Design a binder for this molecule. Sequence first.
Ligand SMILES: CC[C@@]1(O)C[C@H](O[C@H]2C[C@H](N(C)C)[C@H](O[C@H]3C[C@H](O)[C@H](O[C@H]4CCC(=O)[C@H](C)O4)[C@H](C)O3)[C@H](C)O2)c2c(cc3c(c2O)C(=O)c2c(O)cccc2C3=O)[C@H]1C(=O)OC
Ligand SMILES: *Cc1cc2c(nc3c(=O)[nH]c(=O)nc-3n2C[C@H](O)[C@H](O)[C@H](O)COP(=O)(O)OP(=O)(O)OC[C@H]2O[C@@H](n3cnc4c(N)ncnc43)[C@H](O)[C@@H]2O)c(*)c1C
Length: 492
Amino acid sequence: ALVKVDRVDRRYQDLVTRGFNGRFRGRPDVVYVVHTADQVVDAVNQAMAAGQRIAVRSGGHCFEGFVDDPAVRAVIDMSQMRQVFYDSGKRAFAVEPGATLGETYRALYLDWGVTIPAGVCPQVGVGGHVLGGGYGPLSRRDGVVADHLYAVEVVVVDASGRARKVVATSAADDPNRELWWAHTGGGGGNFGIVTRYWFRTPGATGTDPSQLLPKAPTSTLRHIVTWDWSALTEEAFTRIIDNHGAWHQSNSAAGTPYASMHSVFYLNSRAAGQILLDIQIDGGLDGAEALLNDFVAAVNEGTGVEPAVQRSTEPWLRATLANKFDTGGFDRTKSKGAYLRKPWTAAQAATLYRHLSADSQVWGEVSLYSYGGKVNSVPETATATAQRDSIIKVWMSATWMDPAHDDANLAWIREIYREIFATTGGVPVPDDRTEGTFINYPDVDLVDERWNTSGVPWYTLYYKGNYPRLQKVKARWDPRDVFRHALSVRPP
Ligand SMILES: CC[C@@]1(O)C[C@H](O[C@H]2C[C@H](N(C)C)[C@H](O[C@H]3C[C@H](O)[C@H](O[C@H]4CCC(=O)[C@H](C)O4)[C@H](C)O3)[C@H](C)O2)c2c(cc3c(c2O)C(=O)c2c(O)cccc2C3=O)[C@H]1C(=O)OC
Ligand SMILES: *Cc1cc2c(nc3c(=O)[nH]c(=O)nc-3n2C[C@H](O)[C@H](O)[C@H](O)COP(=O)(O)OP(=O)(O)OC[C@H]2O[C@@H](n3cnc4c(N)ncnc43)[C@H](O)[C@@H]2O)c(*)c1C
């Protein structure tokens, strides 16, 4: 289909409210619904000629709703572009940005029995997920998704003011390899518009597609372990915390049995009823069941309370395609993350318990992700995802329904964060204990001095020593600063 232009058209509301986060709703003059890269070129050229500030939506999961900022006048929506295929020529797999993770997972698996180590949520977009290095349950095993990025097709704009389509590959002799590099965890609205991504494991021989990317697990064995809040004490919570963290520091970053395990520890508040440890592993590996109960046995060894355990073995795709991320009306969110190099302290664990145990008036939680593994095998400088020596990733949030309570919710999430990172100035500064935070977790509070961040800039936080190299890319492929937003890479 030819390019579509949505201006005071009946399709407007639907397009402007596609964002995941109900807090931010767009008001651009127009939305362009694109179907080909050439259409993307046209749309860009039309907005520049109208001086419409551009934004791209693929998946709409942007936690900070950047695309829906009131300064945006042009929104290019890629949701009609979700083609996925293999190219025998290129020895690579075709995936368009409009595709959902759930769709790519299903297409890659059924035709070839393979996958990519991407995120968990099935409705997440490929478009703004891969270029910032979205990770998931198989990262431990196979690394970041961008560890399997061969090439990217992008629409960029000339110093002369011209939109152009360009291809950037990971070949050493490719003059655009720095553009490819930029797309391996530089993040979303900075370098142009990706129209197609190419995947192949750098260690991949031959012409057989089934052996050109990691193979899906035989099955998914799951244990959900839950501990009720009423039987939880500050002391037992802390043993659990300290126990969890000591294990993650001993068990990861290699190609071992436990490299294939993933867990999320949902540290819910005292309204939620319980804290939940959600663990999974390939049901086809030897003594699979044994590694899982050995881990939880390590998790609550010095504890005073005994958890519940629910076990199940399901087909990998079925388990993978659960829409168990139901918003349930509570569509407003605020969140903030961190990369841990070493476990929380005695004091941080205690910050955690008090703020979670409290009769807050808001739905708060702390999630801890098992991490490391194969991701830690790539040199920090080898991709634009620098964080390559962390053992756990954390994501903290508040979720609500009524905008009248934005103030109470916002207060909550900021307070827990600043307090556990208080010894630095309320932020996870890359040092011997952390490695900053994750670009797909934007937090514009990182640029507010009337809060946290003591002495360290936001870009140190997200990219460490990799930022200058990203600045030089910004200048070469987007000299006119056509692609920007609040937490945007700046030219030097
Ligand atoms: C599941 C049922 C219910 O809990 C749903 C809802 O709870 C959230 C929890 C998550 N959140 C945003 C952190 C979930 O995010 C998702 C998507 C996210 O983007 C997250 O995904 C991660 C996963 C991995 C990543 O790396 C990363 C950051 O994203 C998360 C794991 O799950 C999701 C959207 O749902 C919820 C409920 C009940 C109440 C609230 C809820 O939010 C309330 O918020 C609330 C209140 O504010 C005031 C009074 C009462 C209540 C409630 O009773 C339940 C329900 O709705 O059924 C009726
Ligand atoms: C909603 C949500 C997000 C999740 C979830 N789980 C994740 C996980 O398991 N691992 C992760 O690593 N990340 C997870 N995320 C967090 C992230 O939001 C996602 O990984 C992605 O950011 C989602 O991207 P997308 O859905 O495409 O959202 P958009 O708002 O459209 O884009 C975000 C960002 O990217 C830019 N952008 C979009 N499209 C393009 C193109 N084609 N080219 C360049 N840049 C693009 C946007 O402008 C914006 O800046 C689980 C849940 C439920």
